[PDB]
Design an enzyme around this catalytic site. Sequence first.
Site, PDB file in Angstrom:
ATOM      1  CG  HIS A 126      -1.928  -1.060   1.284  1.00 43.57           C
ATOM      2  ND1 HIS A 126      -2.833  -1.308   0.273  1.00 43.57           N
ATOM      3  CD2 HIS A 126      -2.190  -1.963   2.256  1.00 43.57           C
ATOM      4  CE1 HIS A 126      -3.607  -2.325   0.620  1.00 43.57           C
ATOM      5  NE2 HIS A 126      -3.233  -2.752   1.812  1.00 43.57           N
ATOM      6  N   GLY A 134      -2.068   2.039   4.954  1.00 42.63           N
ATOM      7  CA  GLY A 134      -2.463   0.648   5.191  1.00 42.63           C
ATOM      8  C   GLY A 134      -1.436  -0.233   5.890  1.00 42.63           C
ATOM      9  CG  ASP A 161      -2.936  -8.827   1.007  1.00 43.83           C
ATOM     10  OD1 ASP A 161      -3.958  -8.201   1.389  1.00 43.83           O
ATOM     11  OD2 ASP A 161      -1.956  -8.999   1.748  1.00 43.83           O
ATOM     12  CG  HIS A 163      -6.593  -5.622   2.170  1.00 42.28           C
ATOM     13  ND1 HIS A 163      -6.148  -6.566   3.084  1.00 42.28           N
ATOM     14  CD2 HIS A 163      -7.663  -5.020   2.741  1.00 42.28           C
ATOM     15  CE1 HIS A 163      -6.916  -6.531   4.152  1.00 42.28           C
ATOM     16  NE2 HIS A 163      -7.852  -5.605   3.973  1.00 42.28           N
ATOM     17  CG  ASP A 250      -4.862 -10.298   4.153  1.00 42.67           C
ATOM     18  OD1 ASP A 250      -4.623 -10.823   3.045  1.00 42.67           O
ATOM     19  OD2 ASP A 250      -4.669  -9.068   4.386  1.00 42.67           O
ATOM     20  CE1 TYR A 289      -2.515  -7.795   9.544  1.00 43.03           C
ATOM     21  CE2 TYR A 289      -4.196  -8.420   7.937  1.00 43.03           C
ATOM     22  CZ  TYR A 289      -3.107  -7.645   8.305  1.00 43.03           C
ATOM     23  OH  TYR A 289      -2.586  -6.729   7.422  1.00 43.03           O
TER      24      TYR A 289
HETATM   25  C1  LIG Z   1      -7.903  -3.498   9.309  1.00 40.04           C
HETATM   26  C2  LIG Z   1      -7.587  -2.036   9.186  1.00 40.04           C
HETATM   27  C3  LIG Z   1      -7.840  -1.167  10.231  1.00 40.04           C
HETATM   28  C4  LIG Z   1      -7.532   0.177  10.076  1.00 40.04           C
HETATM   29 CL1  LIG Z   1      -7.867   1.295  11.431  1.00 40.04          CL
HETATM   30  C5  LIG Z   1      -6.972   0.660   8.900  1.00 40.04           C
HETATM   31  C6  LIG Z   1      -6.714  -0.216   7.857  1.00 40.04           C
HETATM   32  C7  LIG Z   1      -7.028  -1.560   8.022  1.00 40.04           C
HETATM   33  O1  LIG Z   1      -6.791  -2.445   7.020  1.00 40.04           O
HETATM   34  C8  LIG Z   1      -5.524  -2.434   6.395  1.00 40.04           C
HETATM   35  C9  LIG Z   1      -5.341  -3.855   5.897  1.00 40.04           C
HETATM   36  C10 LIG Z   1      -3.872  -4.099   5.678  1.00 40.04           C
HETATM   37  C11 LIG Z   1      -3.650  -5.261   4.746  1.00 40.04           C
HETATM   38  O2  LIG Z   1      -3.706  -6.441   5.096  1.00 40.04           O
HETATM   39  N1  LIG Z   1      -3.353  -4.906   3.523  1.00 40.04           N
HETATM   40  O3  LIG Z   1      -3.071  -5.939   2.662  1.00 40.04           O
HETATM   41  K   LIG Z   2      -4.671  -8.555  -3.840  1.00 36.96           K
HETATM   42 ZN   LIG Z   3      -4.247  -7.495   3.226  1.00 35.00          ZN
END
Ligand SMILES: Cc1cc(Cl)ccc1OCCCC(=O)NO
Ligand SMILES: [K+]
Ligand SMILES: [Zn+2]
EC number: 3.5.1.98
Length: 361
Positions: A126, A134, A161, A163, A250, A289
């Site tokens: 990110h 992120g 991922d 995300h 994740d 996680y």
């Molecule tokens: C779960 C979460 C909480 C907050 Cl406060 C801000 C962002 C978030 O998600 C980021 C996800 C990170 C990730 O696994 N990116 O691949």
């Molecule tokens: K992805």
């Molecule tokens: Zn992720």
Amino acid sequence: LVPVYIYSPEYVSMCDSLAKIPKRAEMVHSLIEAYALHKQMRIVKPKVASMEEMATFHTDAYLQHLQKVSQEHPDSIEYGLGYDCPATEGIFDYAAAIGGATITAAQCLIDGMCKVAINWSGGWHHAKKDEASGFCYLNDAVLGILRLRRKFERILYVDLDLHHGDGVEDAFSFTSKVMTVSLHKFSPGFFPGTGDVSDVGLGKGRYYSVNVPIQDGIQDEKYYQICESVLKEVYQAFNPKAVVLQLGADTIAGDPMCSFNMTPVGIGKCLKYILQWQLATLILGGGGYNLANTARCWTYLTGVILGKTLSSEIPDHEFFTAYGPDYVLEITPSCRPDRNEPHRIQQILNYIKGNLKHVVI
Ligand SMILES: Cc1cc(Cl)ccc1OCCCC(=O)NO
Ligand SMILES: [K+]
Ligand SMILES: [Zn+2]
Ligand SMILES: [K+]
């Protein structure tokens, strides 16, 4: 010929020292070691990234700010620091270690040391050129891709991922030298909010970004069907010379994100498909996680890379008591619905096929 494994005790300690969940890197390595997989790899100590290396992507102003707040600030909000990316002591050295590890893996690939190089603590997809995002302070995936560009004229980035790999996609949005492919949850309100199938990149990079928006509850068979379909078309259209593969865990059943419903076997089939291309391949981690499941996943995928079948019983080792209640390697999907409508998925695949017709090497 054997895969490179980027590892040292010091590196693991650094990765965990400011990780969102403590001991993840230590648990992943501990399980890999318990299965004796490290004996089948070439263990390479990571080099820390120099300022000039980090600045291949990140701005000097951002890097200098990171360095300053890491020492023991009014500008920090401008640089994306403060909430999910805290400005705590040591973050610059931390980030430079993970960036350096991914660059080291890339360099091993350039030098022909190996065809597969692994940094399970990388994949921070990110971060932007001039801001943290992120949980990501530095974008090691971009840094690895830029190192690979010293040799390889076309690089494929594949991001599995949960995300959207927005930082990597945005870094290469305007170029056709790097194609980015991301499979991710896409739903209004779900981070980072980008990466609909209509997101195809910009300018000279138009059609060199591929995005596969997926809904909650997807399981192995359907996911692999989607992934194989897209990567087959991408490989044929783009003819990559090297691959960078982000394998954030994740997506795996039992993750607190509680979105996809994958097991490591499904992700493994995707990995096998990419490995059979026999290209230089840089393997990264990412999100994940549930600590024991993330270790299960990346250990299983290390076995896939090595062509090994692992025992189902978690070996006796430091963290054995974390693997309850079942103490086996396999992960059982959760009993919840797959929200992916097959005609929606086919429509997405049809769009992507149409986009990739424009990709002209
Ligand atoms: C779960 C979460 C909480 C907050 Cl406060 C801000 C962002 C978030 O998600 C980021 C996800 C990170 C990730 O696994 N990116 O691949
Ligand atoms: K992805
Ligand atoms: Zn992720
Ligand atoms: K691109």
